Structures are given as structure tokens and as C-alpha cells.
């Protein structure tokens, strides 16, 4: 996250860290039920040196705060049994950039480990709304990752404005969130983490999946996020959740 601040310990108890074996933190994800995580499809693509699509190559850490303290009380480690990438995921365009990760054994709910709420298919996160992005990704473009989970406040951007800012690259599955002036944005290694939106009784709903941006926190290059309401039925059908 660029232009953010340290999270308080346990402030985002749905935020999960995905480690590929021998590589440390690669992507974020969100806990949505005892057994299920939401993340970005683009995190799970094989390349010629590593089968990022293979569930056995991954460790999920729940209730994590500090990358250097993965064994702290309240931290839960879990393997994955299955990765489902959206069937319509387009690796060129990052259309449909969403995956569901099945935990090998259920999370244990605690004050540090708790699911985010999913929005109904008809819910619209409106333009202008303040929402939160979190993660252990780069804290500058061309920078290094955070040891301590970072939070930043960003704002939903009008879709037409979004499409005009990034011509030929924005589909209806994507949402711009952040500021035309830059300054606060998600970044490399935040990918697949949730946007957290404070809703009417103060409960947090997931408003997006961190997907891509042109660099990070540049002027006129807001962060691009996979929308959640559009996949409520897809999540239901694949997970039971």
C-alpha cells in the first residue's frame, strides 16, 4: 500500500497473507467463511520456474500482523486444498481477476480471525464512497514490501472517469478506487487482498479485490479492482457461501 499507515494489531481480521513455498508473501486474500478465501486469479498462474496454480505450493496465514512474526499468538497457518480461478479470467486484460481458495482445514474464528461480509449481487458501492485498502505490498512504486500490515483510505471513482483514464483497458468487472491526484494506492504484493467498505451499521463488506494499476499512486492512474457484487452468485455456487 502506498501513502498508508500501520494497521492496529487485528484491525483487519479478514486480511490473509498468501506465501508461495520458499518465496514468502506473494498475494493477499480475504477470509469469507470457515473454509473459503477470496483472492485474485492472476496470483495463481504457473510460470516456467514455479506452479503458482497448484494448491500444494501455498501457505495461508490468518490473523497475521507482521511478516517477521508469523508464529505470534493468534496467527493461524493453513494449507490450500483447491484454487478455483474464474473461468472467464483473461490474463492479458485481467478481466474476471478473481479466484476462490479452499482452506485445507477450517479457520478458527477469533478476535484476530474473522470473515468479511459479502455484498449482494444488486449492491452498488457508490462513486465517492470512502473505502479501505490493506496489505503487505510495496509502500512505493519501485519500493519494498511492508513488514507490518498497511491500511490506506481511498475513494470509489466514477466508471466513465475510470474508463477514460485507462483507455481500452477497463471492463465492467473492474472498478477504479483511489484519487486522481495519486498519493494513496495499493501496489505489488497487495494483489488479491480485499477492499473493506464500512456499511450502514458499521459492519465491513468486501468492495473489491486488489487487481492492477499503471505503477502505483501516480497521478491519473488510480488502482483497478475486481468488483464483488457481480460474483456473489458465482461464490455461492462454487463454495456454498
Amino acid at each position: 500500500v502506498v501513502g498508508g499507515t500501520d494497521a492496529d494489531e487485528g484491525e483487519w481480521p479478514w486480511q490473509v497473507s498468501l506465501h508461495a513455498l520458499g518465496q514468502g508473501h506473494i498475494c493477499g486474500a480475504s477470509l469469507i467463511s470457515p473454509n473459503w478465501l477470496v483472492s485474485a486469479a492472476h496470483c495463481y498462474i504457473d510460470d516456467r520456474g514455479f506452479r503458482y496454480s497448484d494448491p500444494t505450493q501455498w501457505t495461508a496465514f490468518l490473523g497475521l500482523h507482521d511478516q517477521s512474526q508469523r508464529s505470534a499468538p493468534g496467527v493461524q497457518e493453513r494449507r490450500l486444498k483447491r484454487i478455483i480461478s474464474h473461468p472467464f479470467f483473461n490474463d492479458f486484460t485481467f478481466d474476471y481477476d478473481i479466484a476462490l481458495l479452499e482452506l485445507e482445514k477450517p479457520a478458527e474464528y477469533s478476535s484476530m480471525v474473522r470473515p468479511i461480509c459479502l455484498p449482494d449481487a444488486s449492491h452498488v458501492f457508490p462513486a465517492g464512497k470512502a473505502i479501505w485498502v490493506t496489505g503487505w505490498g510495496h509502500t512505493q512504486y519501485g519500493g519494498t514490501g511492508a513488514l507490518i500490515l498497511q491500511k490506506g483510505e481511498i475513494r470509489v471513482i466514477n466508471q466513465t472517469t475510470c474508463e477514460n483514464l485507462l483507455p481500452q483497458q477497463i471492463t465492467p468487472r473492474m472498478m477504479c478506487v483511489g484519487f486522481l491526484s495519486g498519493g494513496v494506492d495499493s501496489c505489488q504484493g497487495d494483489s488479491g487482498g480485499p477492499l473493506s467498505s464500512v456499511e450502514a451499521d458499521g459492519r465491513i463488506f468486501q468492495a473489491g479485490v486488489v487487481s492492477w494499476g499503471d505503477g502505483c499512486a501516480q497521478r491519473n492512474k488510480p488502482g483497478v479492482y475486481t468488483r464483488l457484487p457481480l460474483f456473489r452468485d458465482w461464490i455461492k455456487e462454487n463454495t456454498g457461501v
Binding site: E11, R114, P115, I116, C117, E199, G202, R203, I204
Partner: peptide
């Protein structure tokens, strides 16, 4: 869901 959604609280601390």
C-alpha cells in the same frame, strides 16, 4: 462477519 465484518467486525472486530
Amino acid at each position: 462477519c465484518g467486525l472486530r
